[PDB]
């Protein structure tokens, strides 16, 4: 039976400097935290983040985090940089299938 | 360690297309493909590690995927028949990454990905 990844929220709205906070829910436990992140922005193909829930990818930033086990995962952006509004993406791979979460829209906040 | 994939398709209801992917080691390690439609995010639909030939398909897609690879020619595909509107979609080849040459433990999830194919079913 596959594993059903959901991420909340659909839509995060925040502005530059601010942190984020992005869940993934498993409908079952996650083999060996094997749990990755992704950033995909329009047109492009997506972009790892973390692997093994916590480890940070080859050339990420330290303002990425990854944490969470069993059913529960975050990723965190403690500071928000113009160039992370973007669409982020979990994915399990401990189990067959591979399965990913519908994706969080990370967005700036409309004007007042 | 790059991935180039084949052009845009635009396909009648019911046909078959077949994505290629050319890396540029390609027969030890694990290449999936994975699709996305306008506006389903990611959907991972099976794998192949070239050196075993063979393929592993989510059962989503079991009886109408092939995935095929070429070691002389470096090079995946896959092949996706009776297509329907809802096959509309952005079509990856990945490759998992490694920590390293054969001195990199595999990683399991997706350091590198093609380009995408936009494969459109009228």
């Known amino acids: 039976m596959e594993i059903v990844l959901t991420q909340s929220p659909g839509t995060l709205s925040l502005s530059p400097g601010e942190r984020a906070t992005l869940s993934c829910r498993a409908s079952?436990?996650?083999?060996?935290?094997?749990l990755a992140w992704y950033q995909q922005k329009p047109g492009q193909a997506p972009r790892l983040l973390i692997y093994?829930?916590?480890s940070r990818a080859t050339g990420i930033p330290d303002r990425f985090s990854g944490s969470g086990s069993g059913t529960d995962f975050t990723l965190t952006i403690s500071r928000l940089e113009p160039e992370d509004f973007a669409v982020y993406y979990c994915?399990?791979?401990?189990?067959?299938?591979?399965?990913f979460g519908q994706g969080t829209k990370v967005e700036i906040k409309r004007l007042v | 360690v790059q991935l180039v994939q084949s052009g845009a398709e635009v396909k009648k209801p019911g046909s078959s297309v077949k994505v290629s992917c050319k890396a540029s080691?390609?027969?030890?390690?694990?290449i999936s493909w994975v699709r996305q439609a306008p506006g389903q995010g990611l959907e991972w639909m099976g794998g192949?590690?070239?050196?075993?030939?063979?393929?592993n398909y989510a059962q989503k897609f079991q009886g109408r995927v092939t995935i095929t690879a070429d070691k002389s020619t470096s090079t995946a595909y896959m092949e996706l028949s009776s297509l329907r509107s809802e096959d509309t979609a952005v079509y990856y080849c990945?490759?998992?990454?490694?920590?390293?040459?054969?001195?990199?433990?595999?990683?399991?999830?997706?350091?590198?990905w093609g380009q995408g194919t936009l494969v459109t079913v009228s």
């Open positions: 990945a490759r998992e990454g490694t920590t390293g040459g054969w001195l990199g433990k595999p990683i399991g999830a997706f350091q590198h």
């Open positions: 080691t390609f027969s030890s390690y694990a």
């Open positions: 192949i590690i070239p050196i075993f030939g063979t393929a």
């Open positions: 079952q436990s996650v083999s060996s935290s094997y």
């Open positions: 093994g829930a916590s």
């Open positions: 994915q399990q791979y401990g189990s067959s299938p591979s399965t």
